[PDB]
């Protein structure tokens, strides 16, 4: 029979008012014989009607996947509203319901510790810059890098790690050509999290 997965919005989308967060209800293993899927969506138990219906798409072995996307309001998500996807299909004994919402608990503001290139690092042709981001709650967070108002994409970020006080931490590492660092260019890690003022902070590194 079909399976249902309800994906939360991307943290960056819920935190930036200019972006559009959405929850995504994914139904896989829909049979060729009983392929109609009906979606009902609810926000705190109240039915909403603005979801997009996507055309079914082919999977292997005579099945389809069928997806429905509901745009959410940033403030609704951040206020802890519950989004429910109800999935109806003839092959299902009963409709499948999934509910998702933001993690509960007191939000806590991320702190950042920066780390410039090690002594050994400065001998190579590429250097690494690090931002350790810590003490935040919920674990939903977005970390990106930039320099001189342009994005810097050559970075890797660990998953959030649970700390002993129930907050989270991670690190992000940007790797750049050493010449760009030696020139004196400033590189910054931008952090977006709901507990920050205006959801945003930035820390900077340059050759000192």
């Amino acid at each position: 029979g079909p399976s249902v997965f309800l994906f939360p919005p991307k943290p960056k989308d819920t935190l930036m008012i200019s972006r559009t967060p959405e929850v995504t209800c994914v139904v896989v293993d829909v049979s060729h014989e009983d392929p109609e899927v009906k979606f009902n969506w609810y926000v705190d138990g109240v039915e909403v009607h603005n979801a997009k219906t996507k055309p079914r798409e082919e999977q292997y072995n005579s099945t389809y996947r069928v997806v429905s996307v509901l745009t959410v309001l940033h403030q609704d998500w951040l206020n802890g509203k519950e989004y429910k996807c109800k999935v109806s299909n003839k092959a299902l004994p009963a409709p499948i319901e999934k509910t998702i919402s933001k993690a509960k608990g007191q939000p806590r503001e991320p702190q950042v510790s920066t780390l410039p290139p090690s002594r050994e690092e400065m001998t190579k042709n590429q250097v690494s810059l690090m931002c350790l981001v810590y003490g935040f709650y919920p674990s939903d967070i977005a970390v990106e890098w930039e320099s001189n108002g342009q994005p810097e994409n050559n970075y890797k970020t660990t998953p959030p790690v649970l700390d002993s006080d129930g907050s989270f931490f991670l690190y992000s590492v940007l790797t750049v050509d050493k010449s760009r660092w030696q020139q004196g260019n400033v590189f910054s890690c931008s952090v977006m999290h709901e507990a920050l003022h205006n959801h945003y902070t930035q820390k900077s590194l340059s050759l000192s």
């Binding site: 935190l15 930036m16 200019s18 990106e144 930039e146 108002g149 342009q150 977006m192 003022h197 205006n198």
Partner: peptide
């Protein structure tokens, strides 16, 4: 009092 990220609006207070 608004925060901007790479020219895009983040949030306002």
């Amino acid at each position: 009092d608004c925060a901007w990220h790479l020219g895009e609006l983040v949030w306002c207070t």
